[PDB]
Design a protein around this ligand. Structure first.
Ligand SMILES: [Mg+2]
Ligand SMILES: [Mg+2]
Lengths: 105, 98, 97, 96, 94
């Protein structure tokens, strides 16, 4: 009951929302395993991804990357039955978000 | 269960988690903010009375260590996280699961 | 049930997995010691399931030696391609049913 | 279960874990006060499985932390700071 | 059921593990490892016909890797094909 999750964020397309079948609580969970900075990212430019979840008054950066210092982070965080939006609030990317898209429990 | 995300700064250096049965807080990542002062050590200390422990779980510094992934858990416990060194910001990520 | 270990290089820049309940877990992507200093090595994962195509590893001698995607692919073929760099790059994981 | 957090320093270089009990070591972290460029090595000793070996090699300026994610189902386990003055922090948990 | 911890060096550049399974959690470079020297650990598992580096370490760049790979019912041999180490391999057998 899983599917690979892989989305890309850029200055031009800075947001991605996960909301698998809006309102229906069947145990769906999104697990974010890795957030990776693209090879083309300008050296020394901070790239920050912020995660947003209304369900928990949540708004906080989950990744701070910079070519030359931090190429990737492995949050291994999860979001359960909730609408989650990832936004590139700093930098032009690209930034890739990888994880597990769990359909139910 | 629910995502856990709190921010610590010089202006607000402490947060507490106090729920109960079967509840556990898993701390997956502690990340240093982009604005953090270069070469400034930022230390997050966890305090858990129940398990008689007060110890740093993150030592970060722009230019050396941007993040740590403790992957530690606090089962059926009240827990306080404090930024005891540095001005931050520092982000603590995890989730609660019963 | 079986260890998965494949090598990608400029000469052999692509590998495909066709294995049903069969699943492929990718645990680590590692840059070889002979990889050129300062050369970006990018591995792209591709799968017909959900039309997937995205880099899953960006490596570079002197900056990033390895990544741990810890991602999985279920009942579907998966192709890994070294779209940038000459490697060698190693992909590690396992196949389980 | 219970959280496991212990500190090792030159002045207090060893800690022993005693009592299906399993000790899982998740992270070994180098303290901010650790001398720059100083190697700090934590050795583990688990007789039940016959193994004395370093499980962490840290150094300010190079490696701030390691995530062993190793477990000892075994009885008693001793961690010792065999190199360096620390402080070094060991985090994990005891699971019944 | 048991902690696995072995050391590889130029002098002792081989280790053999011969329901049984071996999970490799961490491969760590020793403090005495020569600065800037590449240390490569190759795993060889006959059952799946794989011989491939599982760790590439170097003092000053990469102190450790966390493969988190597993080997199901099979003989496994780890060889330090490059470098003098010491290199430590940690995990557990089930
Ligand atoms: Mg924008
Ligand atoms: Mg303070």
């Amino acid at each position: 009951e899983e599917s690979f999750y892989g989305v890309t964020l850029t200055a031009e397309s800075d947001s991605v929302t996960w909301d698998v079948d809006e309102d229906y609580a069947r145990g769906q969970k999104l697990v974010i395993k890795q957030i990776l900075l693209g090879a083309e990212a300008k050296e020394n430019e901070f790239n920050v991804v912020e995660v947003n979840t209304p369900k928990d008054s949540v708004q906080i950066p989950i990744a701070v990357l910079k070519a030359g210092e931090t190429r990737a982070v492995n949050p291994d965080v999860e979001f359960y039955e909730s609408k989650v939006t990832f936004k590139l609030i700093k930098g032009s990317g690209p930034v890739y978000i990888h994880g597990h898209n769990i359909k139910d429990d």
